[PDB]
Design an enzyme around this catalytic site. Structure first.
Site, PDB file in Angstrom:
ATOM      1  CG  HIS A  41      -0.598  -0.174   2.540  1.00  5.81           C
ATOM      2  ND1 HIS A  41      -0.931  -1.088   3.574  1.00  5.81           N
ATOM      3  CD2 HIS A  41       0.154   0.761   3.260  1.00  5.81           C
ATOM      4  CE1 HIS A  41      -0.295  -0.694   4.343  1.00  5.81           C
ATOM      5  NE2 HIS A  41       0.354   0.145   4.527  1.00  5.81           N
ATOM      6  N   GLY A 143       1.919   5.730   9.936  1.00  3.66           N
ATOM      7  CA  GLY A 143       3.502   5.665   9.498  1.00  3.66           C
ATOM      8  C   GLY A 143       4.227   4.420  10.039  1.00  3.66           C
ATOM      9  CB  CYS A 145       2.173   0.663   7.443  1.00  4.68           C
ATOM     10  SG  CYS A 145       0.694   0.859   7.989  1.00  4.68           S
TER      11      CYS A 145
END
Lengths: 306, 306
Positions: A41, A143, A145
């Site tokens: 993503h 942030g 991830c």
């Protein structure tokens, strides 16, 4: 003595964390050998995340659209590919801090340490369990991830989790390092149901054994039970059923303390039916299920790592 | 979202841990620049620990009696001295992995991370608080002495604790890195009283603020209180008195959530008087006091380190 929720030392993983930026999206990546792994993503805007077509979005991105930064130095990206829900960025330099490692897909109820990171930099480390419904109850902000979960065996890091999503219920979902989500979750900002979060019975029993080893004995009773009797109770309280495999795993703790597994089950049964009457066990006022039997043995014997 | 007991990343401290052996006693040491710090009891046998005269025991030991091993390589000891309850072994090589660091003596109620180690090798990391009675509730087995506690501010490691003793009550005592014990404890195997272990009120309030930030709101009530009214309750429940300094420290959390500090105090007061009626807050069935207000701000905003 004493018993604490304890994470693995994070140094070997700290040396693998990098920052990955694509367009205006920045998250964390894991740099092992000459490959950087990160959530796919990273190629999405906040708008894209509502209904992404990752294949079509990735078609627009070239190697030079992926900025990879390790500390204050830039890595040259020479190849990219999507594997399930992770991207693999081939870089021109092997990470000199790469530890011995493997990728492992863990089972529900297993535990692992998480190194929470932002912009490629470590923030903290904590211990958590893959729930039976394949979520984790983590601490993750925007942030985070690309943060990873891992176990260590002497000198070898087994990576088992990469963080991808926060469900609208506030629990967390992510993948193995091959990019396959744990559970039914998808990397899309849509409502997603986790399902009933049951308690990890074998872990509760291991923790009760840990309590006995440390002198917390008040909950031991004069009763025993059978597997089928106990499991009737377990079902009522949303505990996972206990199998003979679980009994076998608890054997060494049974041996150490001289408390038959089924006797401990009967103590757990009375705890479920009567509560803890305001008492505590190992400093907790509820039954803890994020210690595996192996975690208890490790901590109670002082196993070290390189 | 989510809120977890979280330790600092331990990598900078992992690179400082060594094994120190004197005679038949082996424990952990901390290698910074060309000095290795370790508990002075490394010079004691199990018998000596009953009533040690450390000055007289150390008179028999020469530089070559202290074996210092980092990984699988031996450090040459060129000087030794006793500072309070720690030994300082001067070695001929500066630790190349020395981080930026300072020695700090922390206040009761402060928190820090512990890297538990055996034979110079890391085993795990966990978060804990210096209790008001100057003990810590750790997880330490024989051989863990010399393990250290620390905080990190960006790239600088503040070492605040070195582990020395387990009291017969199962709680733990140790020193700052200048070798001065926290509290009244001595490095002798004798009965030692810790004193009343009170609850760290300002930390409980910070954690309640953390709960509100994460959507756990049920405990908010319609009441307010005063500092003197609240503290009458605190005394009854063995909570530390709250001062205006503590109110000031909670200011930013008050501002973020719009809940006046004294309103939160009144919610804590009702929790102390009525219990939690079987409910939980941030996954705990008791009031947690091992998060400082700064810990809450750090975790709730994602502060990172080098």
């Amino acid at each position: 003595s004493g018993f604490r929720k304890m994470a693995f030392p994070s140094g070997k993983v700290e040396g693998c964390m990098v920052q990955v930026t694509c367009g205006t999206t920045t998250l964390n990546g894991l740099w092992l050998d000459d490959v950087v792994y990160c959530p796919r993503h990273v190629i999405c805007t906040s708008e894209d995340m509502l209904n992404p077509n990752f294949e079509d979005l990735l078609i627009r991105k070239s190697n030079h659209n992926f900025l990879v930064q390790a500390g204050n130095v830039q890595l040259r990206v020479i190849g990219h590919s999507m594997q399930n829900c992770v991207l693999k960025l081939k870089v021109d330099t092997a990470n000199p801090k790469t530890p011995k490692y493997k990728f492992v897909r863990i089972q529900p109820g297993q535990t692992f340490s998480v190194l929470a990171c932002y912009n490629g930099s470590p923030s903290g480390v904590y211990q958590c369990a893959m729930r039976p419904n394949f979520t984790i109850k983590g601490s993750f902000l925007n942030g985070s991830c690309g943060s990873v979960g891992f176990n260590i065996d002497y000198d070898c890091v087994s990576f088992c989790y990469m963080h991808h999503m926060e469900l609208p219920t506030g629990v967390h979902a992510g993948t193995d390092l091959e990019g396959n989500f744990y559970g039914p979750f998808v990397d899309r900002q849509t409502a997603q149901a986790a399902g009933t979060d049951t308690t990890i019975t074998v872990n509760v029993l291991a923790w009760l054994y840990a309590a006995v080893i440390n002198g917390d004995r008040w909950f031991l009773n004069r009763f025993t039970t059978t597997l089928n009797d106990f499991n009737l109770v377990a079902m009522k309280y949303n505990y996972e059923p206990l199998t003979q495999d679980h009994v076998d795993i608890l054997g060494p703790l049974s041996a150490q303390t001289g408390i038959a597994v089924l006797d401990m089950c009967a103590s757990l049964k009375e705890l479920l039916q009567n509560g803890m009457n305001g008492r505590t066990i190992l400093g907790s006022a509820l039954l803890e299920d994020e210690f595996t039997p192996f975690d208890v043995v490790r901590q109670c014997s002082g196993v070290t790592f390189q």
